[PDB]
Amino acid sequence: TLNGGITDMLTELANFEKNVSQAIHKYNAYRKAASVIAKYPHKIKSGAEAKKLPGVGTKIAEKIDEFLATGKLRKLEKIRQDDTSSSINFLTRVSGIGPSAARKFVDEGIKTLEDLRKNEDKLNHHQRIGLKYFGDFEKRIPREEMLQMQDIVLNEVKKVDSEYIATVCGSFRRGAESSGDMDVLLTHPSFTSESKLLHQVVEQLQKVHFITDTLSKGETKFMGVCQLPSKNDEKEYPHRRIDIRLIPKDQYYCGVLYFTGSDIFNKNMRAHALEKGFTINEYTIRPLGVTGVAGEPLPVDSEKDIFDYIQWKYREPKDRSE
DNA sequence: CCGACAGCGCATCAGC
DNA sequence: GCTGATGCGC
DNA sequence: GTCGG
Numbered sequence A: 001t002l003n004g005g006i007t008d009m010l011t012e013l014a015n016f017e018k019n020v021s022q023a024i025h026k027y028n029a030y031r032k033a034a035s036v037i038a039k040y041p042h043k044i045k046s047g048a049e050a051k052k053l054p055g056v057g058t059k060i061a062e063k064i065d066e067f068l069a070t071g072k073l074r075k076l077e078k079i080r081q082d083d084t085s086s087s088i089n090f091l092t093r094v095s096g097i098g099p100s101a102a103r104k105f106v107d108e109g110i111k112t113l114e115d116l117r118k119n120e121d122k123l124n125h126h127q128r129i130g131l132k133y134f135g136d137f138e139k140r141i142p143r144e145e146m147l148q149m150q151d152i153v154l155n156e157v158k159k160v161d162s163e164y165i166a167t168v169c170g171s172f173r174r175g176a177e178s179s180g181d182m183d184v185l186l187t188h189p190s191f192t193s194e195s196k197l198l199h200q201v202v203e204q205l206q207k208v209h210f211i212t213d214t215l216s217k218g219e220t221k222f223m224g225v226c227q228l229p230s231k232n233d234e235k236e237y238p239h240r241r242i243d244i245r246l247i248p249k250d251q252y253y254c255g256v257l258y259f260t261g262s263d264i265f266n267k268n269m270r271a272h273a274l275e276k277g278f279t280i281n282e283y284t285i286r287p288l289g290v291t292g293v294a295g296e297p298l299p300v301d302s303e304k305d306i307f308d309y310i311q312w313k314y315r316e317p318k319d320r321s322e
Numbered sequence B: 001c002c003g004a005c006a007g008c009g010c011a012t013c014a015g016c
Numbered sequence C: 001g002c003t004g005a006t007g008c009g010c
Numbered sequence D: 001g002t003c004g005g
């Protein structure tokens, strides 16, 4: 919005650092900078102004000054005209092709979707599914479709065993008008820290032809593809990414809190937890002893139990953007 | 000045 | 056959 | 690239 030109530039530099440079911490630095700028309530007018924000340092302030004076960044222009950097960058858009495989393909003259399709033999199973659904995976999911997807998953899970608990987390649980994918957290009273559960559920979703493809799957984590059924004369829906994570029941609501997010919120809640003598991670909340030693995990029967320990007013998922 | 920067489940590969 | 390292997505 | 110890 106010600073969309700047945040595009920084996101473009981030993707380059990750995909071409293979410099994951510079990618994250650029993303962190773009996220604080996108949240700033003023149209930035200088590099110096931007450097006041956390995560923006000298180099990005100089890039902002150049962008503001000229409307472009020379570094980006050279990157965009570099065929190797652009080909590597494009290929990483396939799910399962990362910076390493992208660079490898491009070294041997494999640079286009068409090249991938003629070189299907050289792709692993995840990359093959990424290629198959290349356009669909980059489409967003309207909330009304997420709602329909929730009803299918929740119902079929219930048909396998009435005592499963399944929760759709991610941006959907925070009320987003659209989501990138579907995140399902699953548990069962029979699965604890100290004790086919996932397979049964996946198989059922396949039998009703909801789940169409499998990227990866083990005893606790399923990553795959699903699609809503359409009516006879309608256009078919896009295929969608869906993950299902089976979490032990004594860690479930810590799981739910973590996978709901958002990232900033989790961070701010973990910061506050320490301040009160507790430490939270994706699995547990533990009390901190006088010297700093983490104690045993506390009992957590609900998401609100976690806020109670750290004497926090319960935040509705709708309000967990920060 | 310089090391940290999140880290885990699953797939795949190198090595034994 | 197995283990441990690494790519990958998140 | 940015931060902080």
Ligand SMILES: Nc1nc(C[C@H]2C[C@H](O)[C@@H](COP(=O)(O)OP(=O)(O)OP(=O)(O)O)O2)c(NC=O)c(=O)[nH]1
Pocket (backbone or CB within 6 Å): A169, A170, A171, A172, A178, A179, A180, A181, A183, A258, A259, A260, A261, A262, A263, A266, C010
């Ligand atoms: N779905 C998912 N999320 C995470 C991270 C946690 C922490 C983050 O605050 C929360 C939301 O992350 P996610 O990438 O799922 O994005 P979301 O907020 O759902 O946006 P979108 O994916 O575009 O709908 O999930 C994972 N772990 C590490 O990133 C993971 O493996 N899968």
Ligand SMILES: [Ca+2]
Pocket (backbone or CB within 6 Å): A170, A171, A180, A181, A182, A183
């Ligand atoms: Ca998500």
Ligand SMILES: [Ca+2]
Pocket (backbone or CB within 6 Å): A136, A237, A238, A239
């Ligand atoms: Ca399609």
Ligand code: NA
Pocket (backbone or CB within 6 Å): A050, A051, A052, A053, A054, A055, A056, A057
């Ligand atoms: Na700054």
Ligand code: NA
Pocket (backbone or CB within 6 Å): A091, A092, A093, A094, A095, A096, A097, A098
């Ligand atoms: Na990719």
Ligand code: NA
Pocket (backbone or CB within 6 Å): A180, A181
């Ligand atoms: Na996503």
Ligand code: NA
Pocket (backbone or CB within 6 Å): none
């Ligand atoms: Na350095």
